[PDB]
Structure 1
Amino acid sequence: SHDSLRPKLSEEQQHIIAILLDAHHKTYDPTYADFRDFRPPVRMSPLSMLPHLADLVSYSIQKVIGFAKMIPGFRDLTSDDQIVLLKSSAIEVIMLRSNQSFTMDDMSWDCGSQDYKYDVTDVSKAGHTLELIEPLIKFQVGLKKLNLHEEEHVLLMAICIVSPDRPGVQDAKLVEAIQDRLSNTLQTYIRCRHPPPGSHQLYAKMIQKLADLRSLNEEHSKQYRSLSFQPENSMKLTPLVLEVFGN
């Protein structure tokens, strides 16, 4: 109450933001140049997009880990806690980071050529049902409409990762200490740098998106468990996806 109700950003809070922007810029490629290295998309054989999207998700996990390692304090947690945090958050951070390529026009992910322009049918062709697709699209539209500053977007991803309430977290207080520093930075940023309106209720709306991501995670996990139970599907995944999501 002090760091949270702070009128203007401290020097420390400014450094936190700068660090997270750098971390995002070194782990998010807006030219999507590496996508050409994945197994090719196959559209139009109902799980035909599973290999390509498994490669996309595996690549995305590597980038999320790269980002997480730069969050102030994250690398100072025990290795087991780092693992737990990343295993639990990876799909949610993927959902958050993907919003940068999401377009409300045709509710697709533009990455950024026609072959790597992904829609609801592509998700369907990875084995997912409307029980996931529908709330996933709702979330993407809801997030896009918040019109976050890049500063808020990177703070939200970091807050998502360093969540002390994940199952299996050992040193919850240490995790909470990092998350609080980040949450305070976000609150102070919105108060002093985000112009009215749209700063109105923005912080609570962002926290609500974190809760929404938990629900999306649960649904994705249930469907993933169903899909990956069949070893001929698991075979089509990548070693990192199996390791991080389980087998």
Structure 2
Amino acid sequence: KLSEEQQHIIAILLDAHHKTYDPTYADFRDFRPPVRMPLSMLPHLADLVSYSIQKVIGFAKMIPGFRDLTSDDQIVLLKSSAIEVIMLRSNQSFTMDDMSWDCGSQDYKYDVTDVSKAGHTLELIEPLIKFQVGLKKLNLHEEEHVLLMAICIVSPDRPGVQDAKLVEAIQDRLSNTLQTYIRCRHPPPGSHQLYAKMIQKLADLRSLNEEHSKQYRSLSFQPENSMKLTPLVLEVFG
């Protein structure tokens, strides 16, 4: 079974996600307005990204063991997993009806044309959509969603890490919870290699990250475009 500490970890991660994720998307009215008719969607989406980073930061601080890390290990982990964890948390609004992210209204319904009007090409967007579809098909419990997001943040393989053993032991505690949770709470056939498919998704995110790094560096090459971004977005990415 799931032990008391493992139940504790889950209760924490769920509540931490409930406090950083507003399924009504109310605060979307504060972003620079979307324009759909080049880079005409970069201001609105740069804003949603900047907001999303703040939300991921607030979630990170609630991960049991994250507070034991040094301020520097804390910065390296969040800096490299930011786009990955935002990709993961976006799956909660992604709809397979039309392959898009549906955030309340038609104005905040983003599709492949909107993401391409943010200055990014199909080389990344096609794998991004395929990723969201494969994640949706896993039909994870909200508990599995929060654990995966936590495991993706506390990864010891991220370059610049100092106390790799500490990050490792924090992640193992989250991994074991997840593995136990699938075996105790998740029933067949949905549980079938569900853990291995969840880890595969983490690998698909490493690929999406690496391509993101490239297309971001070319988009932000021209000052006219990094001029449309946010201070936080520029600090996290470059």
Say yes or no: TM over 0.5. yes
Q: C-alpha displacement at 1:68, in angstroms? A: 0.2
Residue 40 of structure 1 aligns with which residue?
A: 33
TM-score with structure 2 setting the length: 0.99
Residue 13 of structure 2 aligns with which residue?
A: 20
The CA deviation string for residues 187-211 of structure 1, in whole angstroms up to 9 with x for no partner, is: 0000000011110010000000000
Consecutive unaligned residues of structure 1, counting only runs of 5 or more, are: 1-7
Q: C-alpha displacement at 1:112, in angstroms? A: 1.4
For 2:86 and 2:211, locate their aligned partners in 1 and report how far apart those are by CA, in whole Å.
Answer: 14
For 1:75 and 1:167, locate their aligned partners in 2 and report how far apart those are by CA, in whole Å.
Answer: 20
SS of corresponding position for 1:70? coil
The CA deviation string for residues 123-171 of structure 1, in whole angstroms up to 9 with x for no partner, is: 1000000001000000000000000000000000000000000000110
For 2:66 and 2:80, locate their aligned partners in 1 and report how far apart those are by CA, in whole Å.
Answer: 15
Residue 102 of structure 2 aligns with which residue?
A: 110
Q: C-alpha displacement at 1:14, in angstroms? A: 0.2
For 2:202 and 2:215, locate their aligned partners in 1 and report how far apart those are by CA, in whole Å.
Answer: 20
Counterpart pick for 2:199 among 202, 207, 213: 207
RMSD after superposition: 0.4
The CA deviation string for residues 190-233 of structure 1, in whole angstroms up to 9 with x for no partner, is: 00000111100100000000000000001111100110011110
For 1:245 and 1:63, locate their aligned partners in 2 and report how far apart those are by CA, in whole Å.
Answer: 16
Q: Tell whether 2:51 aligns with 1:59.
A: yes
The CA deviation string for residues 7-61 of structure 1, in whole angstroms up to 9 with x for no partner, is: x1000000000000000000000000000000000011x1000000000000000
The CA deviation string for residues 82-139 of structure 1, in whole angstroms up to 9 with x for no partner, is: 0000000000000000000000010000001000001011110000000010000000
For 1:38 and 1:75, locate their aligned partners in 2 and report how far apart those are by CA, in whole Å.
Answer: 31
For 1:186 and 1:157, locate their aligned partners in 2 and report how far apart those are by CA, in whole Å.
Answer: 11
For 1:9 and 1:139, locate their aligned partners in 2 and report how far apart those are by CA, in whole Å.
Answer: 30
User: Counterparts in 2 of 1:142-221, with a 5 A limit?
Assistant: 142-221=134-213
Consecutive unaligned residues of structure 2, counting only runs of 5 or more, are: none
For 2:190 and 2:77, locate their aligned partners in 1 and report how far apart those are by CA, in whole Å.
Answer: 30
Q: C-alpha displacement at 1:75, in angstroms? A: 1.6
For 1:150 and 1:32, locate their aligned partners in 2 and report how far apart those are by CA, in whole Å.
Answer: 18
Q: C-alpha displacement at 1:76, in angstroms? A: 1.3
TM-score with structure 1 setting the length: 0.96
Which segments of structure 1 move beyond 3 Å, counting only runs of 4 or more?
none
For 2:228 and 2:73, locate their aligned partners in 1 and report how far apart those are by CA, in whole Å.
Answer: 29
For 2:205 and 2:8, locate their aligned partners in 1 and report how far apart those are by CA, in whole Å.
Answer: 27
Percent identity at matched positions? 100
